[PDB]
Design an enzyme around this catalytic site. Structure first.
Site, PDB file in Angstrom:
ATOM      1  N   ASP A  24      -2.676   2.640  -6.048  1.00  0.00           N
ATOM      2  CA  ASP A  24      -1.723   2.601  -4.947  1.00  0.00           C
ATOM      3  C   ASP A  24      -1.765   1.311  -4.120  1.00  0.00           C
ATOM      4  O   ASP A  24      -1.264   1.293  -3.003  1.00  0.00           O
ATOM      5  CB  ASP A  24      -1.868   3.836  -4.018  1.00  0.00           C
ATOM      6  CG  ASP A  24      -3.279   4.009  -3.482  1.00  0.00           C
ATOM      7  OD1 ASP A  24      -4.120   3.090  -3.630  1.00  0.00           O
ATOM      8  OD2 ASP A  24      -3.557   5.076  -2.901  1.00  0.00           O
ATOM      9  N   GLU A  25      -2.358   0.255  -4.666  1.00  0.00           N
ATOM     10  CA  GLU A  25      -2.497  -1.012  -3.956  1.00  0.00           C
ATOM     11  C   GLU A  25      -2.326  -2.211  -4.864  1.00  0.00           C
ATOM     12  O   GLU A  25      -2.853  -2.236  -5.984  1.00  0.00           O
ATOM     13  CB  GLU A  25      -3.855  -1.094  -3.256  1.00  0.00           C
ATOM     14  CG  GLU A  25      -3.959  -0.191  -2.045  1.00  0.00           C
ATOM     15  CD  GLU A  25      -5.358  -0.116  -1.499  1.00  0.00           C
ATOM     16  OE1 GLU A  25      -6.262  -0.717  -2.106  1.00  0.00           O
ATOM     17  OE2 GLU A  25      -5.553   0.548  -0.462  1.00  0.00           O
ATOM     18  N   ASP A  40       0.841  -1.181   0.000  1.00  0.00           N
ATOM     19  CA  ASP A  40       0.000   0.000   0.000  1.00  0.00           C
ATOM     20  C   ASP A  40       0.889   1.248   0.000  1.00  0.00           C
ATOM     21  O   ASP A  40       1.641   1.464   0.946  1.00  0.00           O
ATOM     22  CB  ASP A  40      -0.888  -0.005   1.244  1.00  0.00           C
ATOM     23  CG  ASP A  40      -1.997   1.028   1.182  1.00  0.00           C
ATOM     24  OD1 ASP A  40      -2.933   0.934   2.001  1.00  0.00           O
ATOM     25  OD2 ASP A  40      -1.949   1.929   0.319  1.00  0.00           O
TER      26      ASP A  40
HETATM   27 CA    CA Z   1      -5.399   2.782   1.646  1.00  0.00          CA
END
Ligand code: CA
Length: 337
Positions: free
Chosen positions: A100-101, A7
């Site tokens: 973002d993951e 993350d």
């Molecule tokens: Ca998050």
DNA sequence: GGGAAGCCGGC
DNA sequence: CGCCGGCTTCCC
């Protein structure tokens, strides 16, 4: 199974500081417009109370000393793409969950030993940090869901870990609100039924439960509560793909728009490559610049034609419901495989 | 089939 | 930060 969830901490703000180091150590707020809102706040900004979703107006009146920048998405995508590419080098399978993951299945990579998995995760935090100066948080666990949960417990710049030996004991002491799918409304009333932790699910009337949660989610919680939950890391990307093309002029005429919409089912579709959508969205952006979208969902992939057939159909629906003038038309694909 | 409603969660 | 774009289930 051995899952590492990665993350990127407050990614948009981190990218801005990397690009402009004079932003470091002062509040920084990244703004999104659709008055605007906060997309992301760096540490100093968050420390003053600035939160994602907060109207820029409210933000300024708690962080007047903050620097407010516009969101520059194409450059954040470039960083993300690079980091995703660092990741897939270390993974058997990688599921990109968003910009973002990412979930990495490294089972077959650390020859099945969770310990070498943890160290792999360390090497991965360090690599991203050295090469991109981006700090990330990672969670290492036997499944996707645990990996995320422990990741969020380890924010920020953390490394969280749940050993296969610890899974049951962990699942046990886990509050119900900490469980994905369990928001405030239904945590509130799982509590009213005496369910405080995930273990309480095991000791309950499955019908009095079901009537408030739903069948599929009651199942979910049960299966979760007994370490019998496991969905695999699919090797794919969930980031919606598509493009919106500006027109010659305003139009509310179906036949004037139709080819523009038809051409967007090319300019994007070429770049779509291997992956195959289950959802189609026609996106219409008014002369007003408001977004008007009609999406449909089909348990079947999407051939070039299955788009067209349902494309204009959805474009119809948009025109047939909104009165605003349309300046740009486009397409969005999601739910890949 | 597909619209309305409630809920989750990202922004 | 309280709002509205995806999923599930209710309803017609
Ligand atoms: Ca998050």
């Amino acid at each position: 199974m051995i899952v590492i969830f990665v993350d990127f901490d407050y990614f948009f703000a981190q990218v801005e500081e990397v690009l402009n180091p004079q932003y470091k150590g002062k509040p920084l707020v990244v703004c999104v417009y659709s008055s605007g809102a906060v997309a992301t706040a760096n540490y100093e900004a968050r420390k003053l109370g600035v939160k994602a979703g907060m109207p820029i107006i409210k933000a300024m009146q708690i962080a007047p000393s903050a620097i407010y920048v516009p969101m520059r998405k194409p450059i954040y995508e470039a960083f993300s793409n690079r980091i995703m590419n660092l990741l897939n080098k270390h993974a058997d399978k990688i599921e990109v969950a968003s910009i973002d993951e990412a979930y990495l299945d490294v089972t077959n990579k650390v020859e099945g030993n969770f310990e070498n998995g943890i160290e792999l995760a360390r090497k991965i935090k360090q690599e991203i940090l050295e090469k991109e100066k981006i700090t990330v948080t990672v969670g290492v666990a036997p499944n996707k869901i645990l990996a995320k949960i422990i990741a969020d417990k380890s924010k920020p710049n953390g490394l969280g870990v749940i050993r296969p030996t610890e899974v049951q004991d962990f699942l046990n002491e886990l509050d119900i609100d900490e469980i994905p799918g369990i928001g405030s409304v239904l945590a509130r009333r799982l509590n009213e039924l005496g369910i405080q932790k995930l273990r309480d699910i095991l000791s309950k009337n499955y019908n009095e439960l079901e009537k408030i949660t739903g069948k599929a989610k009651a199942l979910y919680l049960l299966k979760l509560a007994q370490n019998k939950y496991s969905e695999p890391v699919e090797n794919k990307s969930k980031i919606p793909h598509g493009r919106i093309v500006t027109m010659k002029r305003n139009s509310r005429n179906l036949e004037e728009i139709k080819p523009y919409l038809f051409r967007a089912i090319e300019e994007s579709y070429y770049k779509l490559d291997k992956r195959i959508p289950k959802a189609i969205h026609v996106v219409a952006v008014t002369e007003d610049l408001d977004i008007v979208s009609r999406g449909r969902t089909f348990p079947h992939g999407i051939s070039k034609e299955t788009a067209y057939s349902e494309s204009v159909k959805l474009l119809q629906k948009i025109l047939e419901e909104d009165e605003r003038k349309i300046r740009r038309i486009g397409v969005r694909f999601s739910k890949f495989i």
